[PDB]
Amino acid sequence: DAGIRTLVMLDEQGEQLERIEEGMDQINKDMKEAEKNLTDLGSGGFIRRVTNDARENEMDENLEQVSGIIGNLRHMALDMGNEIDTQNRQIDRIMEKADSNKTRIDEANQRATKMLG
Amino acid sequence: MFMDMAMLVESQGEMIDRIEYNVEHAVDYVERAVSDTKKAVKYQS
Amino acid sequence: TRHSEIIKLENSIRELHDMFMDMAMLVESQGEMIDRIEYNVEHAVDYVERAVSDTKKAVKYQS
Amino acid sequence: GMDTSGKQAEAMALLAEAERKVKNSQSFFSGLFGGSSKIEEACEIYARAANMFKMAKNWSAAGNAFCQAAQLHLQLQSKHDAATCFVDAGNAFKKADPQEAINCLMRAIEIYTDMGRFTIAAKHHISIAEIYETELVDVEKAIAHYEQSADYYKGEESNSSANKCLLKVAGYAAQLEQYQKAIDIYEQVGTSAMDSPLLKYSAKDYFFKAALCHFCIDMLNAKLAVQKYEELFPAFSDSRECKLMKKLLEAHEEQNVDSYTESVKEYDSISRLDQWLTTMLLRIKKT
Amino acid sequence: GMDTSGKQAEAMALLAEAERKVKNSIEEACEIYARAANMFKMAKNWSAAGNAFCQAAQLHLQLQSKHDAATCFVDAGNAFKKADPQEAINCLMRAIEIYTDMGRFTIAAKHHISIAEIYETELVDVEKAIAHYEQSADYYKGEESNSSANKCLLKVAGYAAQLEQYQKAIDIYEQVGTSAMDSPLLKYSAKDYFFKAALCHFCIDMLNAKLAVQKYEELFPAFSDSRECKLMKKLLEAHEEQNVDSYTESVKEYDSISRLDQWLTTMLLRIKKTIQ
Amino acid sequence: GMDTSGKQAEAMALLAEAERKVKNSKIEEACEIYARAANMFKMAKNWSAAGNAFCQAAQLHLQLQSKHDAATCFVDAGNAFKKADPQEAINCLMRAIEIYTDMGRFTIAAKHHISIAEIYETELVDVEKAIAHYEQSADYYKGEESNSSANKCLLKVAGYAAQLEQYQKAIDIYEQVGTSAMDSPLLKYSAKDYFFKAALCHFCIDMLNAKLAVQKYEELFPAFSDSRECKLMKKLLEAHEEQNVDSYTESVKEYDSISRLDQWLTTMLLRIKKT
């Protein structure tokens, strides 16, 4: 259950990351256009049967069940894996943009104060 | 160990939501400023 | 048949363990990065708002 | 400690000074036409006083100051800052008195949706629904708010979030003894999530719920229902839910309440049952 | 190498230039101070970089600027972190004051967490760490960040049980466990917290622990099926007979099945010592 | 292929017309048109010529009044030369790193340091040189409090030093990183592994002190006892006390049956066992 909940939450986080990346791209485009305009303004068993007996059955059965579940987990794990990797790259890619944007505004404001006098 | 992973994932998610909210505010204000600058430039010119 | 099945189970367990190693480390790094970017964007928005407010007040003073 | 009394006294003095400033603002405007500098400064005092009251653990005073600032700045034709201050007041109200927060958030939602900002309106609607759920048991208003938020999210093409709202709506509707909507929502969500890579593993669960919500109507339409799922999603047969359903059907077909109860006990012992599932199983057992 | 002497000489030259510029009487002076401090940091001269940073922060604050002033104050504080722990606390307190005044309570909570961490790791003090953690938890709870508040409260309760009266530990553990019981994802861990609380009741008297465990079993049925409940019942039964042998046998068996945190070890040792 | 010839012709034409335009205020237009020509050359996939033109445009931008654009163009030129003469790319990336450090952005400087170390280690055989850049990047990251990157760089340099037969640096770094990981509430499960590695290195000095080292690790970290690495190490040391080749071979085979051993572990194991 914890595995499944983690998977779904990761999916939601990825969608949110894509949304914020789109927002950042829009911010950059709009700000650049605005600045330019303003400038233009100017398996058989698991235990030995030492004594047979009912106790030896369920134990074996239990082990068998365990094996099954573990198999599933493997796939789950690996699947979930891919997700985070992509996210990593995506996150980094926004930062640069934002940073660049920030820098621009500062210089823009500086210019807006240097042309006046 | 799985139990350990869960909380980290949750915290990262909530932080993502907060940053998203901030981005929406920023873009809205930028668009409004663009509209105001357009008005000023077109009418003054 | 014993050795095959038991070693197979152990191998599966080890595979899961190693995956979780790598990706717990990855998620920790990602958390640090997100922590940085949040403050970055907050400062950016605050400064742009402040500068544009200066612009409004100056232009209204001149006109 | 000293914090309580000191913060209360200083905040009260600052708020009284702000009151005097706003009283003198009208005279200043009449005599000289100073503009809005006095009003903006008074709004700054109000915001600072609200924040100080918030640090002073006096939520009501912070909410009142936020409301005063929001009203004054709305009078200044600035709807955005008014909405922001009203959101802060609503949180303080949800943190002081919730009834006021309801109308504050409604006003903020109206102001935001006037400009077409649907995402913020949906988030505020979700917050209002949560407020209703936590204290009161007035389910109907929560369902209405959740439906509105889900509609907005679907209209924004933001999938995987409207799904959760619809799941909440269906789960709460199934409580009121109205099963058709729950069945429809559960089957739709399950078939939608079947094809997703990550969500696929969860899909099975949804089906089970529908089956339980389909069992109350009549047993005959439950059996058939299971078939319809198994042919579409063969892997469903592997999950424990199918075996549990078949055993429960076999036990009920002959009025064997004891076998049904024993199977339920065993399944609960292996994994603890949820209150929703416990209640629904009890309801089914009544027959 | 050339780095040490060259960067030190250039930093001194830039400091002298900024001092002369202010002597003429201004933003250029602040920029020169910032560049000199950056080069000092690059030179590994950790000390005296925070001094230049604080000078720049004061000069910038002189002209009503507050954001960059707070950022540079935090920069100086973290720079002094390793060279001089004491001054970092004061710089971070100043930054916290400014940020809380302006209302960015999340930043104040993060700085409080950092202050508590530095206090507990390098210097030796528990009361100040407890106070800072409680303040940060209060801020986060006011900001409805439940997970961080839970973490801070858990740490505070752990330290209070380590030294302070166990009442605080009982309260915090009970509240956290009750809150976590209803949560879907977190419910599975709830048992743990409850167990801890019960142990803290043992340190006072056996009857209080018995009543508390009965109440917890009534509240949380699954606690009855937990191995912790069986271990507690067996330990209390052994203690009621003043038989250290059964106590030791049960403790050793439970340790054999699962390793100990070294917290439970301390509580068990304390309880065993007082068996008499 | 038609595409390569067509794109090469288009890029050459654009660069030639850009040169003519600049030869004819003018600095900004020249820089922009040269940047466009460099982009078209990059899409033409002539890596060497495209990188040369791009670095020329970077220098021309340096002639223009701007720093951020200069650093961006320098890093792009370094990436373009990544598949060309390594020396020019290294020089350009070093200049970009110097500019970034001058701007106080130590994190990007550390990233570029790691990148240049990677290209140096993978392309050429000189390993010691990459050690300096890795250590500098680790120092920068540690100064910036990014513990994860510092740990990664320290692990890489420690492994390379262990390969270089300087066991002292490797053991120091491994012990420090392992104890730091054990202290941290997270990553604790990995700590065991580090300890094991240290033991192997310490064996290359002598065998008798290895017993003391493993006992010290045991008393410092009790859980290490239950790890199969501890059992394997103690069994190998006990077997080596008698000069029999079968025992340690059988032990390593039994361990290998579960998980395949890596190249680094295998080479050090062969080195220890053969003598």
Residue numbers in the entry:
A (entry chain I): 41 to 82, 130 to 204
B (entry chain H): 215 to 259
C (entry chain G): 197 to 259
D (entry chain J): 0 to 286
E (entry chain K): 0 to 24, 38 to 288
F (entry chain L): 0 to 23, 36 to 286
Quote the original article:
The membrane-anchored SNARE (soluble N-ethylmaleimide-sensitive factor acceptor protein receptor) proteins provide the energy to drive membrane fusion in various cellular contexts, such as intracellular trafficking and exocytosis. Supercomplexes of NSF, α-SNAP, and either a syntaxin tetramer or one of two binary complexes of syntaxin—SNAP-25 reveal atomic details of SNARE processing and show how sequential ATP hydrolysis drives disassembly.
To gain insight into the structural nature of binary complex formation and disassembly by NSF, we prepared a complex of NSF, ɑ-SNAP, and the binary t-SNARE complex (21bin20S) composed of full-length soluble SNAP-25 and soluble syntaxin-1a (1–267) in the absence of divalent cation (i.e., non-hydrolyzing conditions) and performed single-particle cryo-EM. First, models of the NSF D1 and D2 domains with substrate bound in the D1 pore were built into two high-resolution (2.88 Å, 2.92 Å) classes from a single dataset, differing only in the state of F protomer engagement with substrate. Of the eight 21bin20S classes with the 2:1 binary SNARE complex from the dataset collected under non-hydrolyzing conditions, six engage syntaxin and two engage SNAP-25 within the pore of the D1 ring. Docking the 2:1 binary complex structure back into the seven individual 21bin20S reconstructions reveals an apparent preference for syntaxin, with six of eight reconstructions featuring the N-terminus of syntaxin H3 bound within the pore of the D1 ring. Taken together, we observe that the NSF D1 ring can bind to at least two different SNAREs, syntaxin, and SNAP-25, in various configurations.
